[PDB]
């Protein structure tokens, strides 16, 4: 307003004006160091490791345009866990082949005899990945775990 005098009332005169956050409820620290995070919640259904395979990719293409000191850290990630629930399966799988290879060489002996039952084992397992799609069934992990229970 412009009161009877010729004076002027401005918003700076009546109020403190600053560029700040829209709400001041939640603040986060990374090891006590002030930091913001991108906490991502999953959708119902969706695809877990297939999601995180592109969530990094979406994050990957904006890194170059970052200013001074803006660095990405990973305080919480479920990706390396699932990446291990297969490496701890294939290693058990491979051992289950060699531990069979030796038992064959113990009871009936000879490579010309141990080969036959050891060629028949990856095919059944491989063709099981194939028949997981089929008609209207699955295609998952932990299914790659009952796999070793079936091994």
């Amino acid at each position: 307003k412009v009161n009877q005098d010729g004076s002027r009332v401005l918003l700076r005169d009546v109020a403190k004006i600053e560029l700040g956050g829209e709400n001041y409820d939640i603040i986060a620290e990374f090891n006590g160091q002030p930091a913001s995070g991108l906490g991502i919640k999953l959708a119902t259904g969706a695809n877990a490791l297939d999601t995180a395979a592109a969530i990094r990719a979406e994050l990957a293409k904006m890194e170059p345009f970052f200013p001074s000191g803006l660095k990405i850290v990973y305080p919480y990630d479920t990706t390396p866990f699932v990446k291990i629930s297969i490496h701890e399966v294939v290693k058990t799988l491979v051992e289950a082949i060699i531990l069979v290879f030796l038992v064959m060489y113990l009871f009936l002996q000879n490579f010309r005899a141990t080969l036959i039952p050891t060629i028949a084992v990856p095919v059944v397992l491989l063709g099981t990945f194939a028949v997981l799609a089929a008609f209207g069934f699955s295609i998952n992990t932990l299914t790659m775990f009952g796999m070793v229970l079936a091994i």
Binding site: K1, N3, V9, L11, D13, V14, A15, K16, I17, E18, L19, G20, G21, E22, N23, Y24, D25, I26, I27, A28, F30, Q33, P34, A35, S36, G37, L38, G39, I40, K41, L42, A43, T44, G45, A46, N47, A48, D50, T51, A52, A53, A54, I55, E58, L59, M62, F65, P67, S68, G69, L70, K71, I72, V73, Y74, P75, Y76, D77, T78, T79
Partner: protein
Amino acid sequence: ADAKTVQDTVTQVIEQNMNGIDNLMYMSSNSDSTGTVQITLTFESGTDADIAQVQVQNKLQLAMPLLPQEVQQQGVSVEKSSSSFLMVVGVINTDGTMTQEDISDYVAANMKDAISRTSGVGDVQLFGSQYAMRIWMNPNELNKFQLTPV
């Protein structure tokens, strides 16, 4: 607004407007003192999470104009949920140090928009807040020039 207000003015209006949704076992509510409410319609294990998504939204669309004008502009959304995070992407400063106000704004006005719209994301919870033009009034300085927040 308080917890009792947001229950009667928002929560009850949405809940009473939830009739004829193909499948569902129950619905929950919160209505907080912070002025926030969440209503979760839980469906049968096997129902189309894409069709169960839009039905609920259409009955919210019938209760939409009964909600106050203040809450209408402020959000309102329907999405699929898990209540468990896959990734937390911490973004820290280690040079010309910004702030909780500064990093949280940048991370939202440069990154957050690219996510949430990307690969099958339910809802991203940004740890902070993006910048707004914050005007901090002074009641004595308002009194001095015969002015009200209005």
